[PDB]
Design an enzyme around this catalytic site. Structure first.
Site, PDB file in Angstrom:
ATOM      1  N   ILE A  17       0.813  -1.209   0.000  1.00  0.00           N
ATOM      2  CA  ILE A  17       0.000   0.000   0.000  1.00  0.00           C
ATOM      3  C   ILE A  17       0.852   1.267   0.000  1.00  0.00           C
ATOM      4  CG2 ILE A  17      -2.026  -1.115   1.003  1.00  0.00           C
ATOM      5  CD1 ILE A  17      -1.237  -0.338   3.678  1.00  0.00           C
ATOM      6  N   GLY A  18       2.088   1.202   0.487  1.00  0.00           N
ATOM      7  CA  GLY A  18       2.961   2.359   0.444  1.00  0.00           C
ATOM      8  C   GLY A  18       4.245   2.112   1.212  1.00  0.00           C
ATOM      9  N   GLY A  20       6.617   3.597   4.601  1.00  0.00           N
ATOM     10  CA  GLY A  20       6.583   4.348   5.826  1.00  0.00           C
ATOM     11  C   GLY A  20       7.941   4.892   6.221  1.00  0.00           C
ATOM     12  N   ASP A 139       1.915  16.118  13.807  1.00  0.00           N
ATOM     13  CA  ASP A 139       1.998  15.714  12.408  1.00  0.00           C
ATOM     14  C   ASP A 139       0.619  15.565  11.778  1.00  0.00           C
ATOM     15  OD1 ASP A 139       3.355  15.178  10.079  1.00  0.00           O
ATOM     16  OD2 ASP A 139       3.612  13.037  10.491  1.00  0.00           O
TER      17      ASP A 139
END
Ligand SMILES: CN(C)CCCC(=O)Nc1ccc(C(=O)N2CCC[C@@H](Nc3ncc(Cl)c(-c4c[nH]c5ccccc45)n3)C2)cc1
Lengths: 325, 244
Positions: A17-18, A20, A139
């Site tokens: 999904i991506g 980190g 964040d």
């Protein structure tokens, strides 16, 4: 417990999904429970200092925060059959379907007033829980606000979070929030800051839900403070007495002394939402509303998200970005 | 949330004793391991909370593993390495091995094998699984300060009591007391012992001066027999040393 011992084969990876802060992130299917998860993979020894301290901090913080609007870390699994440096760790999170940034850049979904009512209610509830505990997120941004298909808002990416002591005299890290969501006291060098930094970030989220773009888009701190001043007014002791105590107040300022045009720049926003919006974008952190006060305002007081039909979004995320290099 | 407290009977059946290690030898291994972590972290200028966190990791580790299968100084260096990262006082692993090399002879340093650094790195994965990623630990120091702040009998005598109780907390880390009682109870116990050795009467300094149970204002339902046993285990460390 069994936190850490069970193996990754008890999960079925569906795809990447991506990426980190300390490794890849996978969408995965649980063999047994029938619930979907996201696995943040933690490689060790690629860095000569072992288990990364970024994960330690995120693990340490996420075990003390449990809330319906906070990303839920379920457990930590391992490759197993280690000795053997081969084994890596995986942080198990409940799977979320979208992030706010991808949802808005798809161009495919439109949020009406009631949708934003439910989202901000869930977001401010989750942030209040973090702020009644002694935690700053530092964040918050559109890409860190996750959303599933049941309509539930959840706050994520606690890697940069840290514990603070109220009105205490202890210093922190200055460049914490991404530039488009950074409050003005950080741009002027405040290092002993407060939970108001998270409220400013949520104020940017609120305005970005009524408009389709981020409200303050600059690429440098000087220009970023300029755009903030052009809308929210220039920093001055009349609205913010303590600006004179900030490290960079004198050496970085807008060319003009601006008057607050926030209600005219965003006149298309409904009155109650514009009231909360104006409250969250106060220059002076001490005048900025707390998460508790934001829940008590006119726009969010009577919102019960569990009793509102969620807005329908793409069953999956796809920014549909035009081919661009 | 896991459970990190054993009774006197379960501490007599640790993995080390099941493998034939005698109670006296395991108690010695625990003393040397805790003092090793203490001396290494002291020479690196580490927080007393960081030293205590590494030592608590060390004691809990040997409720699940045997000293005959895991050399103690390698585990101690590994616990201090993880503790610095948990307590936001990071230290490079190269520094710990260097400091360990400086205090240990070659027979003790032989536990690190041919390549000392990799032994600590590969052990970190085992330690994290053993402590079940339950990294946050609290220690008796904060409660000793909090409880002592609410005494008003005499300024100079309170500070002498705190100073002796602080030393007794350091000595406690050489035993399994952190595996038996919560840190609040250890804090009360070292004040009780310091009050005995100083012949101060702590009840005079409470808001309930008439009432020997001076500690029941801080901890609930703690009988004196529990505190007496903690004192006996601590004074046991002074079998040779002078009490103070
Ligand atoms: C040009 N613009 C920017 C993008 C266009 C291209 C584009 O379409 N991208 C794209 C991005 C993401 C996805 C995607 O699969 N998801 C959407 C995001 C939430 C995912 N579920 C999810 N659930 C829980 C957690 Cl904790 C995290 C999580 C926590 N931390 C993380 C760090 C990284 C990744 C995930 C997490 N992520 C699902 C699909 C497509």
């Amino acid at each position: 417990i069994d936190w850490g011992k069970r193996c990754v084969d008890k999960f079925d990876i569906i795809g990447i999904i991506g990426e980190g802060t300390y490794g890849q992130v996978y969408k995965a299917r649980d063999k047994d429970t029938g619930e979907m998860v996201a696995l943040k993979k933690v490689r060790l020894d690629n860095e000569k200092e072992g288990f990364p301290i970024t994960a330690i901090r995120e693990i340490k913080i996420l075990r003390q925060l449990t809330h319906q609007s906070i990303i839920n870390m379920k457990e930590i699994v391992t490759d197993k059959e280690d000795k053997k440096d081969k084994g890596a760790f995986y942080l198990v999170f409940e799977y979320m379907d979208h992030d706010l940034m991808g949802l808005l850049e798809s161009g495919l979904v439109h949020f009406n007033e009631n949708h934003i009512k439910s989202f901000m209610r869930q977001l401010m509830e989750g942030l209040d829980y973090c702020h009644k505990k002694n935690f700053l997120h530092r964040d918050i941004k559109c890409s860190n606000i996750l959303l599933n298909n049941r309509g539930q808002i959840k706050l994520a990416d606690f890697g940069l979070a840290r514990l603070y002591s109220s009105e205490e005299s202890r210093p922190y890290t200055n460049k914490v929030i991404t530039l488009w969501y950074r409050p003005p006291e950080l741009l002027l060098g405040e290092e002993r800051y407060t939970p108001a930094i998270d409220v400013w970030s949520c104020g940017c989220i609120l305005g970005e839900l009524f408009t389709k773009k981020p409200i303050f888009q600059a690429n440098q701190e000087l220009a970023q403070l300029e755009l903030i001043s052009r809308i929210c007014g220039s920093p001055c002791p009349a609205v913010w007495p303590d600006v004179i105590k900030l490290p960079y107040f004198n050496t970085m300022k807008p060319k003009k002394q601006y008057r607050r045009k926030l209600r005219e720049e965003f006149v298309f926003i409904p009155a109650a939402a514009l009231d909360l919006f104006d409250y969250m974008l106060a220059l002076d952190p001490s005048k900025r509303c707390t998460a508790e006060q934001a829940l008590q305002c006119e726009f969010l007081r009577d919102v019960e998200p569990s009793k509102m039909p969620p807005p329908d979004l793409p069953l999956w995320q796809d920014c549909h970005e035009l081919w661009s290099k | 949330k896991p459970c990190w407290y054993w009774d006197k009977k379960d501490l007599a059946h640790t993995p080390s004793q099941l493998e034939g290690l005698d109670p006296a030898t395991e108690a010695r291994y625990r003393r040397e391991g805790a003092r090793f972590i203490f001396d290494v972290g002291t020479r690196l200028g580490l927080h007393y909370d960081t030293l205590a966190t590494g030592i608590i990791y060390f004691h809990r580790f040997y409720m699940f593993h045997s000293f005959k299968q895991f050399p103690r100084y390698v585990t101690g260096a590994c616990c201090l390495f993880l503790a610095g990262k948990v307590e936001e006082t990071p230290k490079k692993c190269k520094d710990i091995i260097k400091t360990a090399r400086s205090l240990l002879n070659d027979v003790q340093f032989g536990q690190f094998g041919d390549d000392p650094k990799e032994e600590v790195m590969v052990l970190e994965r085992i330690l994290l699984q053993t402590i079940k990623f339950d990294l946050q630990v609290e220690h008796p120091y904060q409660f000793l300060l909090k409880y002592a702040k609410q005494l008003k009998g005499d300024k100079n005598k309170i500070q002498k009591l705190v100073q002796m109780a602080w030393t007794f907390v350091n000595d406690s880390l050489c035993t399994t007391l952190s595996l038996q009682w919560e840190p609040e109870i250890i804090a009360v116990a070292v004040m009780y012992l310091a009050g005995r050795l100083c012949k101060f009467e702590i009840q005079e300094w409470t808001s309930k001066p008439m009432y020997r149970r001076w500690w029941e204002q801080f901890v609930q339902d703690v009988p004196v027999d529990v505190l007496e046993d903690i004192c006996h285990q601590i004074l046991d460390l002074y079998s040779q040393g002078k009490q103070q």
